[PDB]
């Protein structure tokens, strides 16, 4: 498992990579093609919050939905 | 371009 202590022992860039690699397959189950963009969006969040999202599907889904809304708005402006 | 896409096993583009 990825515990708070395990995460905390890693350098900052590695922490983001570790969180990303764990988040990606969970997000990919919900969004087979958009998972990479959504994961990249979520990775700017606090590491502690990202850890919680790994344990709570509801918390992850909520943030994933927010990310999709943001992406749709961004694509409209770009 | 934004967002910095995550690709498994590739160092994340978003890292500065």
PDB file of C-alpha atoms in Angstrom:
ATOM      1  CA  UNK A   1       0.000   0.000   0.000  1.00  0.00           C
ATOM      2  CA  UNK A   2       0.893   3.670  -0.350  1.00  0.00           C
ATOM      3  CA  UNK A   3       0.876   4.951   3.232  1.00  0.00           C
ATOM      4  CA  UNK A   4       1.427   8.533   4.427  1.00  0.00           C
ATOM      5  CA  UNK A   5       4.834   7.538   5.836  1.00  0.00           C
ATOM      6  CA  UNK A   6       5.856   5.807   2.576  1.00  0.00           C
ATOM      7  CA  UNK A   7       4.839   8.828   0.529  1.00  0.00           C
ATOM      8  CA  UNK A   8       6.546  11.248   2.932  1.00  0.00           C
ATOM      9  CA  UNK A   9       9.899   9.446   2.593  1.00  0.00           C
ATOM     10  CA  UNK A  10      10.118  10.256  -1.123  1.00  0.00           C
ATOM     11  CA  UNK A  11      11.517  13.442  -2.707  1.00  0.00           C
ATOM     12  CA  UNK A  12       8.843  15.915  -3.975  1.00  0.00           C
ATOM     13  CA  UNK A  13       8.889  14.935  -7.667  1.00  0.00           C
ATOM     14  CA  UNK A  14       8.775  11.235  -6.812  1.00  0.00           C
ATOM     15  CA  UNK A  15       5.755  11.872  -4.559  1.00  0.00           C
ATOM     16  CA  UNK A  16       3.806  13.310  -7.500  1.00  0.00           C
ATOM     17  CA  UNK A  17       4.849  10.352  -9.686  1.00  0.00           C
ATOM     18  CA  UNK A  18       3.811   7.825  -7.024  1.00  0.00           C
ATOM     19  CA  UNK A  19       0.425   9.508  -6.590  1.00  0.00           C
ATOM     20  CA  UNK A  20      -0.055   9.728 -10.363  1.00  0.00           C
ATOM     21  CA  UNK A  21       0.724   6.071 -10.985  1.00  0.00           C
ATOM     22  CA  UNK A  22      -1.796   5.015  -8.324  1.00  0.00           C
ATOM     23  CA  UNK A  23      -4.494   7.488  -9.447  1.00  0.00           C
ATOM     24  CA  UNK A  24      -4.238   6.735 -13.183  1.00  0.00           C
ATOM     25  CA  UNK A  25      -5.662   3.179 -13.266  1.00  0.00           C
ATOM     26  CA  UNK A  26      -8.517   4.180 -10.934  1.00  0.00           C
ATOM     27  CA  UNK A  27      -9.394   7.131 -13.157  1.00  0.00           C
ATOM     28  CA  UNK A  28      -8.901   5.082 -16.340  1.00  0.00           C
ATOM     29  CA  UNK A  29     -11.658   2.720 -15.141  1.00  0.00           C
ATOM     30  CA  UNK A  30     -14.083   5.684 -15.206  1.00  0.00           C
ATOM     31  CA  UNK A  31     -12.558   7.606 -18.134  1.00  0.00           C
ATOM     32  CA  UNK A  32     -10.696   5.227 -20.500  1.00  0.00           C
ATOM     33  CA  UNK A  33      -9.371   7.963 -22.805  1.00  0.00           C
ATOM     34  CA  UNK A  34      -9.350  11.126 -20.645  1.00  0.00           C
ATOM     35  CA  UNK A  35      -7.516   9.516 -17.682  1.00  0.00           C
ATOM     36  CA  UNK A  36      -4.118  11.018 -18.582  1.00  0.00           C
ATOM     37  CA  UNK A  37      -5.421  14.584 -18.765  1.00  0.00           C
ATOM     38  CA  UNK A  38      -7.560  14.197 -15.622  1.00  0.00           C
ATOM     39  CA  UNK A  39      -4.679  12.673 -13.642  1.00  0.00           C
ATOM     40  CA  UNK A  40      -2.402  15.539 -14.737  1.00  0.00           C
ATOM     41  CA  UNK A  41      -5.044  18.039 -13.598  1.00  0.00           C
ATOM     42  CA  UNK A  42      -5.468  16.348 -10.208  1.00  0.00           C
ATOM     43  CA  UNK A  43      -1.719  16.177  -9.534  1.00  0.00           C
ATOM     44  CA  UNK A  44      -1.579  19.913  -8.742  1.00  0.00           C
ATOM     45  CA  UNK A  45      -3.642  19.200  -5.577  1.00  0.00           C
ATOM     46  CA  UNK A  46      -2.091  18.767  -2.108  1.00  0.00           C
ATOM     47  CA  UNK A  47      -0.436  15.372  -1.681  1.00  0.00           C
ATOM     48  CA  UNK A  48      -2.362  14.596   1.518  1.00  0.00           C
ATOM     49  CA  UNK A  49      -5.685  15.178  -0.272  1.00  0.00           C
ATOM     50  CA  UNK A  50      -4.594  12.984  -3.190  1.00  0.00           C
ATOM     51  CA  UNK A  51      -3.798  10.211  -0.682  1.00  0.00           C
ATOM     52  CA  UNK A  52      -7.363  10.441   0.673  1.00  0.00           C
ATOM     53  CA  UNK A  53      -8.766  10.236  -2.870  1.00  0.00           C
ATOM     54  CA  UNK A  54      -6.966   6.895  -3.269  1.00  0.00           C
ATOM     55  CA  UNK A  55      -8.844   5.503  -0.247  1.00  0.00           C
ATOM     56  CA  UNK A  56     -12.265   7.059  -0.992  1.00  0.00           C
ATOM     57  CA  UNK A  57     -13.896   6.349  -4.411  1.00  0.00           C
ATOM     58  CA  UNK A  58     -16.573   9.012  -3.727  1.00  0.00           C
ATOM     59  CA  UNK A  59     -13.885  11.649  -3.069  1.00  0.00           C
ATOM     60  CA  UNK A  60     -12.005  10.649  -6.227  1.00  0.00           C
ATOM     61  CA  UNK A  61     -15.146  10.619  -8.411  1.00  0.00           C
ATOM     62  CA  UNK A  62     -16.162  14.063  -7.116  1.00  0.00           C
ATOM     63  CA  UNK A  63     -12.787  15.583  -8.043  1.00  0.00           C
ATOM     64  CA  UNK A  64     -12.730  13.731 -11.376  1.00  0.00           C
ATOM     65  CA  UNK A  65     -16.133  15.250 -12.255  1.00  0.00           C
ATOM     66  CA  UNK A  66     -14.832  18.726 -11.352  1.00  0.00           C
ATOM     67  CA  UNK A  67     -11.787  18.148 -13.572  1.00  0.00           C
ATOM     68  CA  UNK A  68     -13.933  17.180 -16.567  1.00  0.00           C
ATOM     69  CA  UNK A  69     -15.987  20.391 -16.123  1.00  0.00           C
ATOM     70  CA  UNK A  70     -12.774  22.447 -15.988  1.00  0.00           C
ATOM     71  CA  UNK A  71     -11.366  20.705 -19.068  1.00  0.00           C
ATOM     72  CA  UNK A  72     -14.572  21.339 -21.052  1.00  0.00           C
ATOM     73  CA  UNK A  73     -14.362  25.043 -20.136  1.00  0.00           C
ATOM     74  CA  UNK A  74     -10.644  25.169 -21.027  1.00  0.00           C
ATOM     75  CA  UNK A  75     -11.232  23.557 -24.434  1.00  0.00           C
ATOM     76  CA  UNK A  76     -13.900  26.206 -25.149  1.00  0.00           C
ATOM     77  CA  UNK A  77     -11.543  29.116 -24.403  1.00  0.00           C
ATOM     78  CA  UNK A  78      -8.534  27.606 -26.193  1.00  0.00           C
TER      79      UNK A  78
ATOM     80  CA  UNK B   1      -0.404  22.689 -23.660  1.00  0.00           C
ATOM     81  CA  UNK B   2      -2.565  22.476 -20.532  1.00  0.00           C
ATOM     82  CA  UNK B   3      -3.194  20.178 -18.723  1.00  0.00           C
ATOM     83  CA  UNK B   4       0.167  18.366 -18.502  1.00  0.00           C
ATOM     84  CA  UNK B   5      -0.960  14.850 -19.456  1.00  0.00           C
ATOM     85  CA  UNK B   6       0.105  11.957 -17.242  1.00  0.00           C
ATOM     86  CA  UNK B   7       1.543   8.907 -19.049  1.00  0.00           C
ATOM     87  CA  UNK B   8       2.296   5.825 -16.879  1.00  0.00           C
ATOM     88  CA  UNK B   9       6.056   5.307 -16.476  1.00  0.00           C
ATOM     89  CA  UNK B  10       6.995   8.617 -18.126  1.00  0.00           C
ATOM     90  CA  UNK B  11       8.306  11.353 -15.808  1.00  0.00           C
ATOM     91  CA  UNK B  12       5.356  13.725 -15.437  1.00  0.00           C
ATOM     92  CA  UNK B  13       5.573  16.830 -17.704  1.00  0.00           C
ATOM     93  CA  UNK B  14       4.072  18.902 -14.880  1.00  0.00           C
ATOM     94  CA  UNK B  15       7.181  18.537 -12.747  1.00  0.00           C
ATOM     95  CA  UNK B  16       9.289  21.690 -12.514  1.00  0.00           C
TER      96      UNK B  16
END
